[PDB]
Design a binder for this molecule. Structure first.
Ligand code: GTP
Ligand code: FMN
Ligand code: CL
Ligand code: CL
Ligand code: MG
Length: 317
């Protein structure tokens, strides 16, 4: 099996365990075909491709196949971001884990300007079905990394900084969201899927939908919020272990850039607090049996690449 980025076809992978079956991977060709950015697609349901002339009866066949966890192939009109119409010969199929449970849906698009029939149709179907099988094999190697921790500790910024090299402005709390990265490890490409989650306690009942089949967890806390730090021990570590007793945990200290920041130190001082020190983070890591303690700053990117490199290594090496 190859890796996912080496499959030059239109396709996406969704996670049906999460609310509304969001896209967790999209190929470059798909993004090109549809004119969306990866940022606009991941974390969302693909229904946005549908439009005025889309046959809603055909859409129901898709919904029905998904609900029954079976494969289906149909042709329907879809639309690009700019409203450009195209015909979509679409194949969907479940990817199952060892215990035969559905883990993902794979979806393959073969685009054209017409509704193909007879021989052309038959050829089209055999083609996308073969592609689907290739994806299934490649997807078995997708590494699942789940990112948890208090609200506002910087889980999302960390993911955006790493995958886009930009830093976000406004703080927007997360429900669920997904990111992907292709990372060189020891000279070989690795596909890394990142599951962003909600820090707020009112999401305690939803959050664990992300947990099954997780390869490595990032438990995050802010180096300049001691409360987020103690919650590592009191909340996140127990929650993670409760669902995933054997999954490796990497402890991540965030906002490294603020630990030596004048104004931040002063504000903490006014609260009768001080920043979390490396030895303190290390000690927490040891206490919860984390395989690595790592500090980083989404803003400056210091220690950022190392976080995801080590995430992968905790799984593969
Ligand atoms: N100085 C500095 N500020 C950061 C850094 N990372 C995040 N922040 C700030 O902290 C705020 C919270 O960032 P988020 O990444 O959205 O926090 P989160 O953990 O994803 O929060 P929830 O989605 O609610 O669980 C951001 O708006 C930034 O202003 C960092 O590396 N350095
Ligand atoms: C793997 C995956 C790929 C999908 N690809 C498409 C697509 O190419 N075009 C499209 O119109 N819908 C696609 N969908 C179908 C929609 O996401 C959605 O399930 C369909 O609209 C029925 O859902 P709804 O009735 O709740 O909107 C895809 C779904 C999944 C599971
Ligand atoms: Cl903070
Ligand atoms: Cl820094
Ligand atoms: Mg967030």
């Amino acid at each position: 099996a190859t890796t996912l980025e080496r499959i030059e076809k239109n396709f996406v992978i969704t996670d049906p365990r999460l609310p509304d079956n969001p896209i967790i991977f999209a190929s470059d060709s798909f993004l090109q075909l549809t004119e969306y950015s990866r940022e606009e697609i991941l974390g969302r349901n693909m229904r946005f491709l549908q439009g005025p002339e889309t046959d809603r009866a055909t859409v129901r066949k898709i919904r029905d196949a998904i609900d029954n966890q079976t494969e289906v192939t149909v042709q329907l009109i879809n639309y690009t971001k700019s409203g450009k119409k195209f015909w979509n010969l679409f194949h969907l199929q479940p990817m199952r884990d060892q215990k035969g449970d559905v883990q993902y849906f794979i979806g393959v698009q073969l685009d054209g300007t017409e509704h193909v029939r007879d021989a052309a149709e038959r050829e089209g179907v055999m083609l996308i079905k073969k592609t689907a099988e290739n994806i299934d094999e490649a997807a078995k190697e997708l590494i699942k990394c789940v990112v948890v921790g208090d609200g506002a500790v910087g889980k999302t910024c960390l993911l955006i900084s790493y995958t886009t090299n930009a830093f976000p402005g406004e703080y927007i709390p997360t429900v669920f969201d997904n990111y992907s990265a292709n990372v060189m490890v020891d000279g070989k490409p690795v596909n890394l899927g990142l599951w962003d989650t909600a820090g707020l306690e009112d999401y305690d009942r939803l959050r664990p939908l992300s947990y099954p089949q997780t390869d490595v967890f990032l438990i995050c806390f802010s180096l300049v919020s001691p409360a987020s730090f103690h919650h590592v021990r009191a909340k996140w570590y127990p929650e993670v272990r409760h669902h995933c007793p054997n999954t490796p945990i990497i402890l991540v200290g965030t906002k490294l850039d603020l630990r030596d920041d004048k104004d931040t130190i002063e504000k903490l001082k006014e609260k009768k607090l001080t920043p979390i020190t490396y030895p303190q983070g290390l000690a927490m890591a040891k206490e919860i049996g984390a395989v690595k303690y790592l500090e980083c700053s989404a803003l400056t990117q210091r220690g950022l690449k190392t976080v995801f490199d080590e995430a992968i290594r905790a799984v593969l090496c």
